[PDB]
Design an enzyme around this catalytic site. Structure first.
Site, PDB file in Angstrom:
ATOM      1  N   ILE A  33       5.483  -8.519  -6.143  1.00 16.60           N
ATOM      2  CA  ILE A  33       6.409  -8.906  -5.895  1.00 16.60           C
ATOM      3  C   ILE A  33       6.574 -10.149  -4.463  1.00 16.60           C
ATOM      4  CG2 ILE A  33       7.940  -7.182  -6.458  1.00 16.60           C
ATOM      5  CD1 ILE A  33       8.668  -6.875  -2.957  1.00 16.60           C
ATOM      6  N   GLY A  94      -5.896  -5.796   5.317  1.00 17.13           N
ATOM      7  CA  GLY A  94      -4.757  -6.222   4.840  1.00 17.13           C
ATOM      8  C   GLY A  94      -4.038  -5.718   4.482  1.00 17.13           C
ATOM      9  N   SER A  96      -1.352  -3.339   2.603  1.00 14.22           N
ATOM     10  CA  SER A  96       0.102  -2.825   3.591  1.00 14.22           C
ATOM     11  C   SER A  96       0.924  -1.363   3.345  1.00 14.22           C
ATOM     12  CB  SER A  96       0.731  -4.205   2.678  1.00 14.22           C
ATOM     13  OG  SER A  96       0.677  -3.940   1.152  1.00 14.22           O
ATOM     14  N   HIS A 101      -4.883   0.691  -3.915  1.00  8.81           N
ATOM     15  CA  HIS A 101      -4.372  -0.486  -5.177  1.00  8.81           C
ATOM     16  C   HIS A 101      -5.247  -1.432  -5.693  1.00  8.81           C
ATOM     17  CE1 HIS A 101      -2.898  -1.182  -1.270  1.00  8.81           C
ATOM     18  NE2 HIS A 101      -2.474  -2.527  -1.429  1.00  8.81           N
ATOM     19  N   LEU A 102      -5.336  -1.879  -6.149  1.00 11.25           N
ATOM     20  CA  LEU A 102      -6.496  -3.489  -6.780  1.00 11.25           C
ATOM     21  C   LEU A 102      -5.521  -4.521  -7.293  1.00 11.25           C
ATOM     22  CD1 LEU A 102      -9.502  -4.242  -8.060  1.00 11.25           C
ATOM     23  CD2 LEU A 102      -8.524  -3.703  -9.872  1.00 11.25           C
ATOM     24  N   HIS A 103      -5.451  -5.449  -6.291  1.00 11.93           N
ATOM     25  CA  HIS A 103      -4.783  -6.667  -6.502  1.00 11.93           C
ATOM     26  C   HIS A 103      -5.887  -7.683  -7.766  1.00 11.93           C
ATOM     27  CE1 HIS A 103      -2.350  -6.576  -2.682  1.00 11.93           C
ATOM     28  NE2 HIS A 103      -3.505  -5.912  -2.516  1.00 11.93           N
TER      29      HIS A 103
END
Ligand code: CL
EC number: 3.9.1.-
Lengths: 115, 112
Positions: A33, A94, A96, A101-103
């Protein structure tokens, strides 16, 4: 509840809406998002692991599956010039949300250093 | 097509090796972007993540588990960032799959 109560656990259980790209029995891919690139999505396991530093040896297949799903979804999204995959760990990373999770970021030139 | 990382795996040129097993190698990046910056690479020549095969899945996860263990061994108790670059937009520097692990400073957002 399976997946825990971070926002990502809630998304897994369809309790908070998300823009889902792909879903299988092991993981979920959905758009971030707060995108940092023209395309920016996340691939998360359905199994709750708080952070990569506490992943178990037997989580290897699942972690690799996040990357395989990430690369397949990137191709499906037309990221034909490439992309960057990122896992953040902890404060210096960083991170969050404390659900692994994999960006996957693409659609523009990514720069070096990676933050 | 061979790369400089193939030469490092074969021990033909030096690198500061942190860890090795039968299927991967971890070594410090020659151009570090953080106080700790190392790479974990498979010994299998996969040129880029976009061509990784389904059967490679657990090997890729092995790179990440090795990366997190080496990060702990190197004292990165405040965290770190793992990166895989693909292609030109991803800034991939060598066409041999590699996992970057960076820490010892605050990593920033966006990640490049
Ligand atoms: Cl690279």
């Amino acid at each position: 509840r399976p997946g825990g109560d971070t926002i990502f656990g809630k998304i897994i259980r369809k309790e908070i809406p998300a823009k889902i790209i792909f879903e299988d029995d092991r993981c979920l891919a959905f758009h971030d998002i707060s995108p940092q690139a023209p395309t920016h999505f996340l691939v998360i396991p359905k199994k709750h692991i708080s952070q990569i530093s506490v992943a178990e040896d037997d989580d290897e297949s699942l972690l690799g599956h996040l990357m395989i799903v990430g690369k397949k979804r990137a191709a499906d999204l037309g990221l034909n010039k490439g992309y960057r995959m990122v896992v953040n760990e902890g404060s210096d990373g960083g991170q969050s949300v404390y659900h692994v999770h994999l960006h996957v970021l693409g659609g523009r030139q990514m720069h070096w250093p990676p933050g």
